Each structure stands twice: as structure tokens, then as C-alpha cells.
Design an enzyme around this catalytic site. Structure first.
Site, short mmCIF file in Angstrom:
data_model
loop_
_atom_site.label_atom_id
_atom_site.label_comp_id
_atom_site.label_asym_id
_atom_site.label_seq_id
_atom_site.Cartn_x
_atom_site.Cartn_y
_atom_site.Cartn_z
N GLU A 155 1.97 2.00 -3.57
CA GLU A 155 0.91 2.63 -4.33
C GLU A 155 0.96 4.16 -4.20
O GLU A 155 0.76 4.84 -5.20
CB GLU A 155 -0.44 2.06 -3.90
N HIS A 156 1.32 4.67 -3.01
CA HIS A 156 1.45 6.11 -2.78
C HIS A 156 2.66 6.66 -3.54
O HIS A 156 2.57 7.69 -4.21
CB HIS A 156 1.63 6.46 -1.29
N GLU B 158 5.43 10.64 2.97
CA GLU B 158 4.20 9.86 2.86
C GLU B 158 3.94 9.13 4.16
O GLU B 158 2.82 8.72 4.46
CB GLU B 158 4.29 8.74 1.81
N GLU C 110 -4.01 8.21 7.70
CA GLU C 110 -5.03 7.36 7.11
C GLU C 110 -5.51 6.33 8.13
O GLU C 110 -6.67 5.90 8.08
CB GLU C 110 -4.47 6.59 5.91
N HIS D 245 0.83 -1.19 0.00
CA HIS D 245 0.00 0.00 0.00
C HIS D 245 0.87 1.25 0.00
O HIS D 245 0.50 2.29 -0.55
CB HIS D 245 -0.92 -0.03 1.21
#
Lengths: 124, 402, 438, 402, 124
Positions: free
Chosen positions: C52-53, C122, C129, C49
Site C-alpha cells: 500500500e505504501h 519505506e 509507524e 500493508h
């Protein structure tokens, strides 16, 4: 028995000329001897209401019809407990004995019976 | 979409190579034509209720046997009723629409128990988004009536069964009905609509009571469920350049986890806020809106200032690169709208019910930097700016501050 | 009859699969990868994940800003999602912008910078998140459902990963993950809409030819999960709506019972009080729930993985004193898949599914998603004629036999969130998985 | 009222010949000075809660033994706390006010269970009148903040215990407190206030955050509970002539079962509507308002047009008779305001706290027909008209229509 | 007995030097042998709550104190049914055994007792 049943059978009789000629006069006498009009009731006020279908039909009455029905039930209850009969304008005249509830209950039952049928459909 | 006519009804169909057909009846019955507030929403929700040939119950049970689906929505211009089914089941769906338009029993219990509660849940779900509220409020300020009527039924002004029955008497008529078939053989649809919709009243064209008038102003909807702000500019002469300008100014990101390279997207940097420019053509007037939502009223206010600056800056000078980026983003937006069944149906519906020929995505005009900057200049120099604030309205900007 | 899905391979073993639609003007191209969070261990959980960022944070050529501009200039958008078993990166564009989009996707997958500065930036975004998923109740419920059903197993882990890992993910482990997993034999280049297959194969030969092949190429959609009957209760009296999921171990993509499980799922079906037609649906549970106001909604599901699945229902309700009735009536409807279902329900569900499986694919992104999912789970796109035949093969005996071995008297995984005081303890829920009268 | 000073507190008292005294503490703490929306209403409702020397319960039980009564209200300028009692019980009441200002325990349970629920019922009772709502809405549009802050606490903006405690730390101070005694011997009051309020903080003068700015606009409050419309005109230079103009234009009838001879009263003929012109001086700005309530939005709209015409007609010519009638109605209004203990307290409170020397009813200026017409002319030709519509707002007028 | 009583008597003892010298050490051993800290309770968690006064005091707890109390009651109930004791951080340390509820109940009772007194006032 369902109101649907009663209404359909009645319509079979009213169609047959012979049958109507003999049944309609009897039915009118029966209603006269029944004597519910002498307590200021309309026929439909007497129908059993403690059923899901009937509770739904009564909720669909227009507010005016509903308030008038409540008054006729209270008024008839007061005649009953006093052992008196209606007089004058309290007596239901034959022209006032309208089937105010029958259309609502027939629609409630129509859907209820269609739902039962469709619950038993078989894809062909 | 081959446009034709079948028994007085305008029918447009496009054959395809898929097992899935979409049939939509588009009705000229949206909220700008609404006799009473909310009637067009209620009429939409009254579709596929009890008809004389077929009960709502029987319809749903049979729809499940075909595996079909049903979609309905109301706009300012139309009511759209769409069905999605397998190609072969077309006759059934045509006949179902005929029953709805010709033979709907509009019964009081359906209104009280079925239709109105569903219409109320529909609205509450939409309003959960404060940006929806802000953009609705903005149209109400800008137009007052007609386009300014609410699209949806609201509790403060109740729709009666007589209101809905009267409106349906106007709307459900050959003059206000267009049939649009996606992945439907056009000759087959014309034959079926020609038999099924033959006995529909002719009626007359539904019209907006009064001319569209433009107004500026402010709306301050105090909610406790999120914050948003629309800055709208009513347009007296709708022009296609505003599409390009909306796509240029942009707002949403074209990439995950990014802000974006659009001026409005760049206005949100350092804030948990989003922005979106939109242009709404309504034929005779238009609305150019920029909506900003966020959790912080302070951040919304901050972005709002940058947003109006962006518009002014655009009115100054656009680069050739930026003008080409606008053409690209605009062609793309046009293409995907003609693909999406909901918007597709209304686009051809507008062509059939009015006479506004559709602009194919491949024929979207390229606007020069001169034309774009000129369009932005008119908007920055508007006499009638509208500002709708939703949420903590004491902390959101006012028109005179912007 | 939809156009045929064309399929080609490259030398490295990259599959290209396409379905053209000459009626649309947009195209969705993208890369479906047979890899996801389940390929991580406990130490690097969250990596997939995280990548993906970073995939959108700049490549060896285009910087973050150049990347933004390049996509803006294309006109369409890029999108990505990472799941437990699948990762997707796609680009929706105009017909003639397809070579640009293939080039950008090839770049962000093969040649991404993964710069320490960007990792560090990030690392805070992803940390935020963790505290905002909390609002997406359906996701909270399903992530707890996987965590408990597959307790201490890879399918049980979340996609975001623990806070601890987010703070310790390095560019090294990111690079290692995508080098081990993003191999050509695990990847499918998919095009749907206004794409030519032969054009797409050429673009694949141009951009994805220098992809590593894995040492041991297994077929696409190749995987041992041991389901735990268990419960998570997240009671929160301040929420007005209860969210409840109940599931049993379901079926994998390639199970022989895959269609039988879908038919059984369609017999219960979905319900939503906000949709007008839902009060008239044929499903027995639908009728019970709507007549008695037991729920705002329910949604039956049958989720599949390569080697297991979860089959169950997700319920939402404000009726906090009748949660017991809601759960009771739902599980008694499941009992009837074992005891009572006949040709009546089975043929009705088959009718509804024959259309439903085709209806779902109504745009280029849905078509691309269907080609990509089927190619990465089954190794092939299954034609609608084959699907129609497998559905037709499902009998009432098949449904009864499946329910008797999968549902009847079986352990459930149960998650409740919100005002769930009325949800009884595990035993009373699990006791409704059978009927004493049968 | 003999103005004096006792231990840094301004004290004004007027002896009389009656057994009943009214002691009022006037605090510079009204809503224009509020820090958080609704705090001045909450602080008002927190008066006579638990203090350290005496519980709310004990206070009420002892007040009943004296047969005293307690009255509190919040304005845009002040909080007024009034007690009415027998003359001889003065020392008890002075000491009670001292306890409230010095020693209120602001406890969270009092806020949740006692204070906030009462504040909510207070507002709901006021809003039952749509004219109240319309005039409140009009101030909000006209001033935005300060004078535009809501007077009352609302659910959308929750006041916290820390908000109220901070505001009370500012307001409950010698600099923001005036004591006003009706039918109280002035020498006796000074002696008692001098001992009781000696240990009160000095504090500093509370001030309005920001200068008063005037704005025009529209407010549209959808209620289902009756209809009203305010037409306000913000005034940058408050002048005493607007009192005469408000009384001239009039609106209410001066005799039963009649309409009245005032221009605004005559505007209502044939309608079940009422009207009232009002002028609000706030020192640094003013508001001239005309409020129309009724059951029919059509009738309200009809009267609203006549009302604006009346104001324009007044700007043209007023007769000598009419100017004398205005002097008479205005002197009377002044007299009764100085009599009513509620308004009396705030009038001297404004003289003591602010410094605006009171205008005695006998010294109310007589305005010539020239001066009245000039004032009305200045209002009809304002750049910033405010219109607040309440009720069926789709059917009520807009500013640009008026 | 009322919390008010218990608190006042305790304060008389704590005032007297002699009394405190002999009572405080006893009270500390009593608490150690009581053993409620070994189930992770704080002393005030044990106070009977099924009375109007106590229900009112609990409603006045700040939300966080209230949520923590619910957890300690559930946790102690789980130790009780399992026949285990708290270990580690679940054991209440003496510095964590704070009288979080006492101020609320003292205010509730203060008003309740003042109301009783004032119901019996005699105008002199």
C-alpha cells in the site's frame, strides 16, 4: 405518595365547587392546628427529602431560596430543642407560606414518570 | 434547490432519489451576532431541550423509533440544526423544528446540568487540536469583535439564562430562519412549513453590533498540548480568487504516504509537520490563513519561513500548469462542499438569509496566472499580518520575524 | 427509493458495479479487492500493508513526482486502506475526471515499480509507524483483541506485521503477493456518484483487461477460526482513561444469524457523555451508565469476517473505582438478551436499524464503500427491500435463541488498557456471562 | 559602603550603630541570564537546601537559636539571598553562605518535594494581584527574551534538576558573587569572606544570550481574578530623567483617604481604580510603565485614556512648581530605596557586579521643566507602545485605541 | 532494625581486614543459600516497606527503577504461586543485585534521625 399525585388530586377538588366549598375551610383549619408555622416553617420545608427525586429538586432551588431554607431548618431545630415557639417575625404568616419547592419537584417527577412510561413503550 | 417562501419563512428544497432526507433550519444567529460571548454556542446546545409540547426525553425516544439523527453546529454566521431521517417521516421533523423555535422552555436546570456541560466538552474536544486554537486566536486578533468574537462558550465569561433567553427572542423569528431540505419534495415542504411556522414571531433581522474592522497583531496561547502557528492576512475586499489561491498553495497531500506537489506541502519536507491554506469569506471581510501544526517548535518555525516565502514566490510568477491545477483543485473543493450536508445547508442558508447567490461548482471561475499572482502579491504586501502561536510560544516565530 | 446498482463482468472475471446519483457532481471510483493481511503467512506478515505504501511510490511510466503531479492536476484525491480481509484503492474526483482516475488506479496496481531504493526508504517509515499506533488507544485495544481471540491464527495477526518482517520484506515477496492475490476474480471496480456504468465498463476494458485470473476461481467472499477465551491486560496507571473491550465469537457475513446479531447489538447500542441526546436514550445500559457516571462512552460492535466474527462492546471510562460496576452492569444487560428480551426491545431495535442501514450511506464514498464491501463479502449488492425483509424476519425468539447460544455462559476475549486495577480477574468477568437467578 | 575585594570576591560593607546586621549575597543570576525559563527562580528557592556540611533541617534549627531570619528573591538582574541576625553572629552567616555556594547537593527529591512546590506558591501569591501580571506581561512583549524572560517558574515550562545544576555551576562562582553587609564592620567581613569563599570556583561572568531588542505589541491575559492594564514604553537609551518623570506623573496618594495631586492620580477621580507610573532601568534598556488596576473594565478603560493624555500634556508644558515637586518626590524615592535592605543590596550589587556607580539620594539631579517635558514628549511619540491587559480582556483597551 | 544501623555495622566489618576475611565469604554463601535470586529478586526488593520512612524512600525512586521493581515483585509473586523458580534471564545474576534503594532510605533516615536529635537539643 408522590407530590404529583397530591397536586393532581388537590386540583380535582379545587375545580369542583361543592368539594372546594367543604374542603378548603377544613384544610385551612387543619393547617392552623398543625402548628408548623409556629416553628417558622413553610409547608414545603416539611416534605421528606431523602429520596433521589427530592435531592435533585433541592439542588435545582435558586441559591437564595436554598440559603433561606437552610436557615428556617436551623432556626426550627433550635426552637425544637429549646421547647419554645416562634414569636413575632419568626412566625410564618399565611402570605409567606409559599410553595417554593413544588414546581421543582413536579418537574423532576414529570421526567421520572415519563421515563417509566417510555421504558414500556410498544411499537405498534 | 428551489427557493420559495412559506408563511414568511424562506424554504429551499431539492428532491432526489434516496430513502434519506436531510432537513436543516439555518438561523442567522452565529457568533458575529452574539450579544454576549458564547451565547450562540449555548443557543445551539439548547436546541431540542424541553419544549412545551414535547420534552427532550420524549423527543429523543421518538427520534430513536424513526431511526432519525440530529446534528447541530454553530459558525460565525449561523446556527445550523440538521435532522436526518427517512423521506416519509418529514411531517414529524417539521413539527419538531416548529416546537423548538416557538416553545422552548429555557429552564435554568437545563442550562446548568445539560446545556453548559455539553458545550464545555464540545470546546475541549476542539481544542485538543492546537491548529483549531491557532485559527480561532487568529480571527480574534484580526477582527476583535463581530467576526472576532469566540464561536464557542468559554469558562472565563459565563452565559446566563437571561442572556440565552434574550438572544433566542431575537434569533428565533421568521426574519432569521431559513429551512433547507435535501431530498425533500419542495412542494410538500412548503405546505408543511406553511402550517407549522405560521405563528412564529416575525421579529427583526439580527445585526452585528458595529462595523467589521481589520487589525494586525499577535496572539500567544501558551498550551502544553501540541504546537501550531497560524499566519493570517485579513482581507478588506473578499474576492473569489482567494479560493483558487488557497487551493493552489494547498498544504495537504492528495495521495497516501506522500508529501504533495503543492508549494506549502513541499515546505514541510524533512519535518513531521502539516500545513493548510484556507480562505474564509464572511461577506464584508475575509481571512486568508496558513496554519502549521507539528510536535517540534523548531520545525514549525522552519516551515513558517518557507510558507511566507512560498506566498512571495507566488506573487512573482505562476505557471499556466499551476493555474490550471488551481482551477481543478478549487472546482473539486467547491463540489464536495455542496455535497457535505453540514456545509451545503449553510451555503443555501447564506443565499436565503442574505442574498448572496451560490456559485455552483460548475461555474467556478478559472483564474489566469496573472490574476493569481496579483492576489498573492496583495497578501505578501499586507499592512496587517496576524500571527497566532499555540504551544511552546517562546519557541515559535513572531510577526516581525516573518 | 435509491437508483439500482448496475453490475457487469469482463472476460477475465473482473466485476464492475456502479450506482449513479445525478444530483452530485463528484464521483468515487475504485478497486475493492477480496484480499488482505489474512492472506499472508507468518514470514511475510506485513506485506499487504507494505505494498500500500509502495503503490504510491512510482510506476513504470510516472515516477513518484509525476504521480503526485498527475493527481494534483486531476483535482481530487486518491486513498487506500488495507484490512485483514479487504484492500481498497479509490479515487474521488470531478465528474469528467473519472477516466483519468481509472487510468491512474490501473497503473499503480498493475505496473508499480517496487524499486529496491523505495523499499529501503519505506522500511524506516513503517518502522516508525510501529511506535506511534501506541497513541491510538482504540486501535491498540482492537488489535490486541484480535490477537488474543484468534490466538496464533491468521486473523490474529496485525496488519503492520512484526518489526522483523519489515526489515526483511523484499521486492520479490511484494511482487509475489500482489500476483497471487490481486487477480481479476477477486477484484471489483466500483463507481458511485456522477458515473455512467457503460462508460466505466469501457474504461475497465481499456485498463484492467490484462489482469491475471486465478487458477481456481471461487465466488467473491469465500473464506478455520477457533476462538480463544482469554485476556490481555495492558495496565498503565499514568493514563487517565481506561479502555476495555469485551467480545465473544460473533457471526460471519453470510451467517443466517447476521441480522439477529445486528438487532441484538442495537438493543445495547452506543453511548457518549459528550453527545447531548445520549442521556435520554432508551437502552437500559445507556440509562445505568449515564445515571451513575460509569463511563465516558461505550460502543457496541458486531464485526464480521468471511468465516467468523467478533461481537462485543468497547468501553471508555475515567471512573477507575467503579470499573467493576461498569463491567458488571454491561454483562448483566447481555444476560437479558437471553433471559428477558421481548417484543418491546426487539421491535424498537428493528425500527432504529431499518433507518440506520440506509442513513449510513450519505455520500459517494460511503456508497462506493457499501457496494464494494457487499460485492466482496456476499458476491452481490443486497437491495434495501431484501434488507428490510431480513430485518423484519427477526423475532424476539430469534434474538433469545441467538443470545443463548452465542453469549450465555460463553468465553469472552477481554482487553484492558490504562488504569485497570479495578478490572477483576478473568473468572469474575466471565462469571457475569450468566445469571444464577435464571 | 566601603567596596573592597576578598579572595576574588567583591565585598561591600557599612558599619552602623545597631544590634542587627544584614548580610546579603548578590548573584548575577537573575532571569535575564536564565538558560531555561524559570531557572533563576528555582535556583533562588534552592538556596539553604541540603549542603554537604549542613542539612536544610540543621540550618533552620540553628538559625532559630540565633533568632536570625532568611530572605531570598529573584529579579531580572540578580538573585539576592539576605540574612538578618545579631551583629556578633556574623561568622556563622558568612560560613552558611559559603556552604550554599560551594557545597549544595542539588537532590531530585528536594526539587520535587520542597523547591518546586514553594516556587509555585510564590508565583500564585504574586499573581493574585492582576497588576503584577500586567507588568510582567508587558516586559515579555517589550523585550521577548533576556529582560523578556519570565522571572518566575511556570508549570508550562518545567525546570529539571539538570537545568538547575548547570545554571548553578555558572552562577555560583567568584565572578558572579558580591557580598553586601549592612551594619557589618567592613574589615571583619573582608577577613571572614577571605577565608570562607577562597575555594569557590572562579568561573566566568554570566552573560545574556543575545542582545536586548525592543518590540511593541499587546498581551491579553484572560483571568477571572480582577482587572489591570499596563501601558509600557520601551526605552532604548535609559536616562535618569525618567525617574523624575515617573515620580511627577505619580499615581499613588501621599496621604490617607485622598486621591492625590499627581496628574495620574487626578485621572482616577470618580473611579475605584489605582494607577502607578514606574521606570525600570536595566542598564542597556529601560521600561516606562503606567499600570492601572480596578474592578471595572469600563473604569480602567476610562482612566487609560486620561493617562495617555496626561503623558501628552506633560510633553507640552510642566510648570516650575511641578518640576520641583518631581525633584522632591524623586529624591525621597531614591532615599527610601537605599534604606530598604531588599533594594539596598541590589543597588550595591549592581555597582559591584556590573560597575554602575550608585547615585546617592543626595546627588539626585534636579531636572528643569524643559528636560521633563522633553522626556515625556519622547514617550508619547514612541514607535513601540506595549499594552498588556489582564482580566476581562474583551472590555479592556487596545494599543491602537490609545 | 534501621537500614542505617545495618549499613554502619557492615562498614565497620568491611574496614577490619581480619573481620572482612572471615565475614565476607560467609555472607556470600548465605546469600547463595537464601535463594532470593532464584525468584528474580534483588536483595533490596525484600526490605519491609510498610513504614513511613520506606514509603517515602520508594516515592523518591526514579520512575524507571520504580517500574522495574514493580515488575520484579509481580514476576516473583507469579513464581511463588506457581511453585516454580526463575530460569535463564529471570535469575538475578550477582552483578545485577544492585542496592538501588539503599541510598534513598539512608537519606530519609538521616533526616528522621537528625530531627529526633534536634528535638532534644539543650541550649548551653
Amino acid at each position: 405518595a408522590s407530590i404529583t399525585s397530591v397536586v393532581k388530586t388537590s386540583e380535582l377538588i379545587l375545580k369542583s365547587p361543592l368539594l372546594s366549598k367543604i374542603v378548603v375551610p377544613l384544610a385551612k383549619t387543619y393547617v392552623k392546628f398543625s402548628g408548623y408555622r409556629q416553628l417558622g416553617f413553610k409547608m414545603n420545608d416539611l416534605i421528606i427529602e431523602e429520596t433521589p427525586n427530592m435531592q435533585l429538586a433541592l439542588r435545582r432551588l435558586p441559591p437564595t431560596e436554598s440559603y433561606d431554607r437552610v436557615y428556617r431548618l436551623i432556626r426550627a431545630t433550635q426552637f425544637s430543642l429549646s421547647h419554645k415557639l416562634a414569636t413575632g417575625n419568626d412566625i410564618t404568616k399565611p402570605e409567606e407560606d409559599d410553595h417554593y419547592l413544588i414546581p421543582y419537584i413536579l418537574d423532576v417527577e414529570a421526567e421520572a414518570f415519563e421515563k417509566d412510561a417510555l421504558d414500556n413503550l410498544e411499537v405498534v | 434547490f428551489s427557493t420559495a417562501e412559506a408563511a414568511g419563512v424562506k424554504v429551499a428544497a431539492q428532491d432526489g432519489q434516496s430513502p434519506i432526507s436531510d432537513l436543516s433550519v439555518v438561523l442567522r444567529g452565529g457568533s458575529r451576532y452574539a450579544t454576549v460571548p458564547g451565547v450562540s454556542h449555548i443557543l445551539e446546545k439548547f436546541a431540542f431541550q424541553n419544549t412545551v409540547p414535547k420534552s427532550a426525553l420524549r423527543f429523543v425516544r421518538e427520534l430513536e423509533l424513526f431511526g432519525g439523527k440530529l446534528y447541530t453546529h454553530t459558525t460565525r454566521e449561523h446556527i445550523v440544526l440538521r435532522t436526518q431521517f427517512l423521506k416519509q417521516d418529514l411531517p414529524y421533523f417539521v413539527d419538531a423544528f416548529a416546537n423548538v423555535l416557538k416553545e422552548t422552555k429555557f429552564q435554568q436546570f437545563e442550562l446548568t446540568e445539560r446545556v453548559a456541560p455539553v458545550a464545555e466538552l464540545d470546546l475541549l474536544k476542539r481544542e485538543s487540536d492546537p491548529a483549531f486554537t491557532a485559527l480561532e486566536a487568529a480571527h480574534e486578533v484580526a477582527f476583535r469583535t463581530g467576526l472576532g468574537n469566540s464561536v464557542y462558550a468559554q469558562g472565563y465569561s459565563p452565559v446566563t439564562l437571561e442572556d440565552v433567553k434574550e438572544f433566542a427572542r431575537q434569533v428565533y423569528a421568521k426574519q432569521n430562519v431559513a429551512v433547507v431540505g435535501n431530498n425533500v419534495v419542495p412542494a410538500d415542504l412548503q405546505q408543511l412549513v406553511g402550517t407549522a411556522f405560521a405563528d412564529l414571531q416575525e421579529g427583526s433581522k439580527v445585526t452585528q453590533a458595529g462595523t467589521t474592522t481589520l487589525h494586525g497583531g499577535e496572539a500567544r496561547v501558551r498550551t502544553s498540548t501540541g504546537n501550531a502557528l497560524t499566519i493570517a492576512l485579513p482581507i478588506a475586499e473578499p474576492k473569489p480568487v482567494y479560493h483558487a489561491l488557497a487551493s493552489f498553495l494547498g498544504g495537504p497531500a492528495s495521495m497516501p504516504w506522500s508529501v504533495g506537489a503543492s508549494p506549502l506541502a513541499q515546505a514541510t519536507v524533512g519535518t513531521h509537520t502539516s500545513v493548510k491554506a484556507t480562505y474564509h469569506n464572511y461577506g464584508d471581510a475575509g481571512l486568508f490563513a496558513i496554519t502549521i501544526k507539528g510536535d517540534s517548535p523548531a520545525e514549525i518555525s522552519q516551515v513558517a519561513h518557507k510558507a511566507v516565502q512560498a506566498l512571495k514566490d507566488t506573487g512573482a510568477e505562476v505557471t499556466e500548469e499551476q493555474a490550471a491545477r488551481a482551477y481543478a483543485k478549487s472546482k473539486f473543493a467547491a463540489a464536495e462542499a455542496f455535497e457535505n450536508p453540514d456545509s451545503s445547508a449553510s451555503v443555501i442558508g447564506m443565499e436565503l438569509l442574505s442574498g448572496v447567490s451560490r456559485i455552483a461548482p460548475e461555474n467556478v471561475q478559472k483564474f489566469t496566472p496573472a490574476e493569481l499572482s496579483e492576489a498573492a502579491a496583495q497578501l505578501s504586501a499586507s499592512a496587517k499580518p496576524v500571527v497566532a502561536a499555540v504551544g511552546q510560544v517562546h519557541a515559535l516565530p513572531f510577526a516581525d520575524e516573518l | 427509493v435509491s437508483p439500482k446498482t448496475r453490475t457487469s463482468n469482463l472476460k477475465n472475471g473482473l466485476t464492475i458495479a456502479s450506482e449513479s446519483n445525478p444530483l452530485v457532481q463528484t464521483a468515487t471510483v475504485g478497486v475493492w479487492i477480496d484480499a488482505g493481511s489474512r492472506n499472508e503467512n507468518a514470514y511475510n506478515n506485513g506485506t499487504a500493508h507494505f505494498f500500500e505504501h509502495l503503490a504510491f511510490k512510482g510506476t513504470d511510466k510516472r515516477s513518484q513526482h509525476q504521480l503526485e503531479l498527475d493527481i494534483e492536476n486531476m483535482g481530487g484525491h486518491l486513498n487506500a486502506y488495507t484490512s485483514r480481509e479487504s484492500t481498497v484503492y479509490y479515487a474521488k474526483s470531478f465528474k469528467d475526471d473519472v477516466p483519468k482516475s481509472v487510468e491512474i488506479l490501473a497503473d499503480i496496481l498493475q505496473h508499480s515499480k517496487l524499486a529496491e531504493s523505495a523499499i529501503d526508504r519505506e522500511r524506516e517509515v513503517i518502522t516508525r509507524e510501529l511506535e506511534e499506533v501506541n497513541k491510538q488507544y482504540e486501535e491498540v485495544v482492537f488489535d490486541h483483541l484480535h490477537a488474543t481471540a484468534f490466538m496464533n491464527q491468521p486473523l490474529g495477526r496485525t496488519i503492520l506485521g512484526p518489526r522483523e518482517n519489515i526489515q526483511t520484506i523484499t521486492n520479490t515477496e511484494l511482487r509475489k503477493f500482489i500476483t497471487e492475490n490481486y487477480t481479476a476474480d477477486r477484484m471489483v471496480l466500483v463507481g458511485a456518484g456522477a458515473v455512467d456504468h457503460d462508460a466505466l465498463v469501457e474504461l475497465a476494458e481499456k485498463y484492467f483487461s490484462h489482469l491475471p485470473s486465478s487458477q481456481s476461481p471461487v465466488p467473491l467472499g469465500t473464506p478455520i477460526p477457533n476462538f480463544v477465551g482469554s485476556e490481555v491486560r495492558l495496565r498503565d496507571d499514568t493514563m487517565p482513561v481506561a479502555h476495555i473491550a469485551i467480545a465473544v465469537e460473533g457471526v460471519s457475513w453470510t451467517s443466517e444469524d447476521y441480522y439477529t446479531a445486528l438487532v441484538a447489538q442495537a438493543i445495547i447500542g452506543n453511548y457518549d457523555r459528550a453527545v447531548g441526546t445520549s442521556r435520554h436514550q432508551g437502552s437500559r445500559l445507556s440509562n445505568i451508565v449515564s445515571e451513575n457516571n460509569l463511563a465516558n462512552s461505550f460502543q457496541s460492535f458486531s464485526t464480521s469476517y468471511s468465516d467468523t466474527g467478533l461481537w462485543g462492546i468497547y468501553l471508555t471510562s475515567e471512573n477507575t473505582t467503579q470499573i467493576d460496576d461498569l463491567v458488571h452492569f454491561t454483562l448483566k444487560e447481555w444476560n437479558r438478551l437471553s433471559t428477558s428480551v421481548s417484543n418491546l426491545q426487539v421491535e424498537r431495535a428493528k425500527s432504529q436499524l431499518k433507518a440506520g442501514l440506509l442513513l449510513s450511506l450519505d455520500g459517494t464514498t460511503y456508497v462506493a464503500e457499501d457496494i464494494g464491501r457487499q460485492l466482496t463479502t456476499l458476491g452481490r449488492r443486497v437491495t434495501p427491500a431484501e434488507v428490510e425483509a431480513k430485518l423484519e424476519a427477526v423475532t424476539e425468539h430469534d434474538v433469545r435463541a441467538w443470545a443463548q447460544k452465542t453469549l450465555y455462559d460463553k468465553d469472552i476475549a477481554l482487553v484492558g488498557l490504562g488504569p485497570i486495577e479495578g478490572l477483576y480477574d478473568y473468572n469474575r468477568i466471565r462469571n457475569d456471562m450468566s445469571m444464577m437467578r435464571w
